[model samples]
Target: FTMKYVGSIDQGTTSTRFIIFDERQRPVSVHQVPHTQHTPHPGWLEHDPMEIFRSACKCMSVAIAKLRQKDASFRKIEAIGITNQRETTVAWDRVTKEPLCYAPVWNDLRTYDITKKVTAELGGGDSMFASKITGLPVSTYFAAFKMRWMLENVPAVADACRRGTLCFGTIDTWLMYKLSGGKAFVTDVTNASRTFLMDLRTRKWSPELCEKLKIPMETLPEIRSNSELFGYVETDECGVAAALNERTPIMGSIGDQQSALFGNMCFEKGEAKNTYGTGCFLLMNVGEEARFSKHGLLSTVGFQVGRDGPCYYALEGAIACAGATVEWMRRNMNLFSHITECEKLARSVPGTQGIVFVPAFSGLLAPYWDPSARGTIVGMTLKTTRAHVIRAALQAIALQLNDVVGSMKRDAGLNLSSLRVDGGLSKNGLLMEIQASLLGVDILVPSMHETTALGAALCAGLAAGVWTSLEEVKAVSRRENSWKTVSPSGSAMEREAMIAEWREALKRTKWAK
Candidate 1:
């Protein structure tokens, strides 16, 4: 029996999700498991590579089982695509095919010291030379020196590399390698851009970058495109892997945010989308021509689906704390029993009532990338209740996004038009209103917030001959809802005041002495 379903694995920062979509781009089945985040220190965040891989298998298995039970005739599982968390680094023993330790998560700030060292060695503060060379500001968020620290401190990592029995890759490569039973070790161009290992000019792994960081040549994975059939899942020999057909093609893979950017069909220049996952990511497709940023934004490979052809480019802005801040409020403060309560309490008030929460909790990213900075809640007074605090928390999510949209406008030189939003937080109506008002644009929320999964499925569907042409995908756009054409009255001015207050609050959070 043949199945007409396309499966997508979205390996996110906090969860592993599997979503099934039909040829019409509609969601059929979905399942997710929120994975544990390992934080070994104040500035460190990690995940056991094994745990992440297991989570993906479990998620897909459960979702497929659920679908099969619901409809006995469901058997059309086509090619699988992976869209996942980006920039999280890992160093592993290639011979054993295991990591030296827990992967250094994207939010890990332990590399701050190393980032500062590299920046100074390359040039001074605001070094354009460093930015141009890497298409990213000298920052701790990248994988370059994160791998360096592992090589220097972790004896096994260094030994394995010297013995040619070790490999280093971002999470995407890790997933591809394990999924293909170690037969395919590759990463899509979109995920490759965040590593600082690829040159912006050539879009290939840079030996100069490897030489600068003193990283060995053998550990790197071959870079691949986002849409091609790279290889098949090696289920025949691997007894400990997911139980799917051993030879299903791995048709599409891209960074989680770029996947959403494509799923949203932001295929044209000047188009953009913001993914509100664990960390809020705003990516703007800058077309095929590489447009380097002068405004602190990172230039990254937007998409690469063609052979012997120029790839698409994008500008990226990352925020370390988006949904994670909500988790803190629930777990740390015990402010509310549920997320909706926080929203309901905020709805009880007109606005945060002069309270502002700067959720630089795990430090900040994009526009700032201040990992040393902590979080701050200003204007907390005797009059401020827990409800006001909750209100401030929700607004903080949008305020950070507002900062990025502002930066994208400045860097890409694109006028503020419409901002497309997805992921968990976009479900909050109050937060969407906050984002729409602050950004002074119509924030479009898709019919399905699971764009990450949809993206990979769309790619698989195209490759499996389920869909034809990118234009057809865009033409069949399924918008869940939309705001009106005009901006809300006086929202721009109100947001400006809020933005000013937010900056001051950020200063306090950065341990501003």
Candidate 2:
């Protein structure tokens, strides 16, 4: 064959995508499928595992068929890699091979009560009691708290747990199990790190935390590295197996943020990337040693290539809202009719003037970790128009990121050389410039649209020998695409003034309590 290819399943919080990449690290073709956002109650979110699986299969078959038709030289996808929404946990039966309940999404706050209990009772009112071991605080964001909620709440999941038919995992394990036709149940280090049940130092399931959290070790999947042969595709759902044209090895599983880190080529220490998707996740590689955060940031496994490969570590800071603020201004607040207008409106105004919009709609994450924080805007006047509010909303996202980056620098003890940015929100040029100005750093906006998907594809390609090494992958990317460098335009005084107002506005956000 003239060219070999690899496929990636980028199962996201909002949708699923099946992307095939060529030897040059180029996206040959992609098919996207969106899924419903389920809300059983206010502040609670879930996803039907069946729906997500079906969406992934359908996207795979359609994209493969389209590629096969366009290029006659294509025979089959050499291997498949899966990267997904990290902390979204699912409970399913081993015998029936179906989900027992809808998967609790990463941001679902249904576990709020559980978090309080764990912190008060188990942690003695310290959320970071186990932070040294798990590299995470007891929060509503992690996976074990959600798993505990399921056991205590969902009847079907509870019954499955008692009957010894339950299998609990994040999106990575669930997707792999379904894709392998129920043969393999596995998770990677990155996804496992978000579970609160995995030990950051050992890179395996922690029996101490599991016992303390009451999560059974047996229900968990075998933890693997980022790139490896996990299983073979045995099921034909949506004709995905047939479309593959042959047995394809399922390899390369990582959580979405770590995948983005790998995809953005932040492999060296002090390198960082911020993905502005539904939320903002800023991760910095801190080298091989896992660095526990004194701040509210998370210490996590960055990536590992092989079974015994040297695992790099990361310090991560997360903001719960970024693009969500933009969407809210469009669909809910009626600020602007179209997304393009969002930037135009923001740019129309010189700045927020004196106003600051804190989009803590889902409380705050990272540096703040304040569950009591609420969306609050301050210093508004009659002169303040929709344009000012829109600009303030954008500023709010950048400010949150600025705080997270600050925390990452302190935790990792390294200065940010530059930041590689991607995601749907990264496409917004105005936001990029604002982000660069706030951080006083160069923002490298990638030309590749599918960096996260390409991350998993690179993992699979490496495992399948489609490419030999990480250097080869980087070389191909260099030859294929270029970057648009956005530098800081604002002066020190201007940035300091904005940050001062931002801090003043944050004091008004703790209205939830």
Candidate 3:
């Protein structure tokens, strides 16, 4: 036997990846497998739970193989860390643990009616009951409403739960259960926070919330700190891990975005990272305490390193359709072949040229929780070609991010001088510059752009004792990277005028009364 290495398993909405990272935060090898997004009907998004399970297994096996080939000593891969997409709830069986219903994705808006019903039962529309208990707002995006819908509508899930013969969890718990051979039913604080079910203060499922939402505690998973040991490998039972020799210890886990926050070393209070993937999520470390927001931002767990490791909290903001808007242009509108083409076409027009895109495709989230709001392009004339529309679409992503940053500054009283950015779209200089100018701050991009994957790798390293501390990991990722500083090029008056036009355009499209 050689030594030990760590593997990070990242189960995302669109893909699954397994990566091995050294102590220095460098990835040795990775295997990625893309899975299909199932949209069986309007306003629904799902992934066959089996597909996700299979992809995760395949990725892990392939990554380990790649590592062993490169450095034969890599055969000593030690532990696995899990980072998954938040609020994509999975319902499975207790007897067989097979999925009973399709995993309800975070993007699906089918639970809005449930959200409204729950909100009304609590009080008014913005009842703090849901958010105060769960550290999440009363919105369709969270798992409470989705789970409620599942119990009421899906006969298989409902019957199983009543019989105490069902298991329900977000992807984290589902992955943990599957990885642990149905022996462990658990999730981390970060993953639990996204469910609108766990209390912010206690770090456990709130009985009050259960009463309000009318959900039973029996249907949930026990919440643990993000970095603690949750379970171990059941290689024989894992759908795709039967080939592995050693039983891997599952040491660390967190929501994908929170994992990225840790991986980016956003440990200090007020430190933030903005990810531009399927959607744009901006998160800031608010320290060990849960700092509730008056603004429509989420208060969530950042992570925990060890037994005495202090819990890290964060304020989160999400723009529901960042890359999804680009996808819509390509697949739905047939505007371009790929994202690169969209970028090129967007650059063709020097600016939006008086067009504005309201990214309400799946309905706006955070700061403006308008579920009935639909997307619209304003200020279009005959000269407004596809390029101009594309430019406007890109600008909307930045503008929406600006809303949350402004809210964070007001609520937390922290002056955000710059934003650390990492993701696929961050590679587009034009988009980054626009994001900086619109938010009136510097945009910092890391040398390694895919910080999402790096985050999971970092978690595995820390949980397995391969890496020491956040300070040490920061040293590895902080090596000088290009910074793009952009300010509104127009005069203050011109900038105000342009902003007023955008505000006026947005005012034209309110939710249905």
Candidate 4:
């Protein structure tokens, strides 16, 4: 067995990248390309499905060629894995073999009207009516609401629906359809979980939810495990097919967040990982059984190794603002001029002094689920400076995560012992320190960047025999990647007081009405 490599396409919000990792779990070659962000209206974000597909192809072509230059023995990728931004709805025609319109991104706000309509009308004043089945509330973030909006609003989408030719799916399905040359139309459970149409426990399309949402079962893709033989690369788009020199099997598919969860080796129950991006996404593995959240958090599939294999479920929570809060402090509030100052200024202050910042600009999500909640700051006095404001915002980020962890603790019946966190914001030492202290758990920062990509590769590797089992993958990761751990640095009383101050401040955040 000579050196073998697996490929992963990390299709993120702003960009797409293709990374090739050897059996050692180290990325050997990588290439990235950015597609246009089609924001036609304010608060509306879309991606040209064709453009994303082309971008991925271009990345694959370039990365494969680059890797060839580095290693002459590398002739082909053992397998291909795709991890993409989840819940971005794409409507296409089965005959046309392309997307009917630009995909509505996961964060796009166009579904707000129907989101409320679905809650009041179908849900009968309870957004959580289907939470038992879907493990989600009626919200704009899920794919079903977006599909409802499209079928009602888009003429092309409606026409296809009437003709029974409409194919609706998330970015995962869209990319796979094109990558397989219109052969394989499927989605992994992790991506399907966010569709709001799949049952969390059954891992199948909820015909009841689909019928209620007016989405026909014919439009959805066949659900599959995260690691399996999804399809093969056949298209020549951007020289991707030719660059490989041999047919590459696409064996892995998962959402970007869940991919990170797997990439961090959170295999057993009670393990968790938090990704600090624009928002802080925390997912806790609850073993095989799905634990529906009692406190507004979502219960969703974590990952499954193979078809008919035991599944791992996770309690998911998200803070609406993390780095966004810091960026706002720079661009809007003039709190700092440079990015470096955000941490330096916050570290300058010992703590929030007496103030707490609840930066719920677009309302709170998970464990609160309050659209009425708005950005509010309390306990500010003359002594409060920008450093205190900056520090308080970081504290708010940590405190919000603490609240989410608390909610998960009560919901899952499992105590979180440690956390692995990765993202751009995870590098801010002061924030990580505060996060560790507040959660009272070690926050591990993996030195090997791009775990999201690595995760998909791992899944593909497992399926393709590049690595035989999860234990081998873990061994490679432990040997190849360096990890740094941040431990608790504050007293439990101080943590409690901060949370108390945070709770009091949140009372004033209910001003959106």
lDDT of 1 by residue, 440-503 (tens): 7777777666677877877777777777778877766643323223244445568788888888
Cα TM-score of candidate 2: 0.93
Q: How many angstroms is residue 196 displaced in model 2 relative to the true structure, after the best TM-score fit? A: 1.2
**Candidate 3 per-residue lDDT over residues 198-240, each given as its tens digit:** 8878887889778777788988988887776788878553333
Q: Model 1: residues >4 Å from true position, as ranges?
A: 1-3, 33-42, 124-128, 236-243, 308-310, 324-337, 351-396, 479-513
- Which structure among the candidates has the greatest TM-score? 4
Best by lDDT: 4
> What is the alpha-carbon lDDT for the whole of candidate 2?
0.90
Listing every candidate in turn, what is its Cα RMSD in Å to the true structure after a full C-alpha superposition?
Answer: 3.6, 2.3, 3.4, 1.6
Q: How close is candidate 1 to the true structure, as a TM-score?
A: 0.86
Residue 24's lDDT in candidate 2: 83
True lDDT of residue 301, candidate 1: 79
Clash tally, candidates in order: 6, 0, 0, 0
Per-residue lDDT of model 4, residues 1-513, tens digit only: 688999999999999999999888889999999999988999899999999999999999999999999898887899999999999989998898987788899989999999888889998999999999999988889999889889888999999999989999888898999999999999999999998899987999999998888889999999999999999999999999999889899999999989999999999988899999988889999889899888888899999999978899998989888989889999998888979999999988788889988899989986777889988888889989999988999999988888899889888898997899898998899999999999888988999878999889999999999999988887887788898989999898898899888888888888866
Q: Pairing residues by index, what is the TM-score of model 4?
A: 0.96
Candidate 1 or 3, higher lDDT?
3
Stretches > 4 Å off in candidate 2:
154-156, 331-334, 349-353, 371-373, 376-385, 508-510
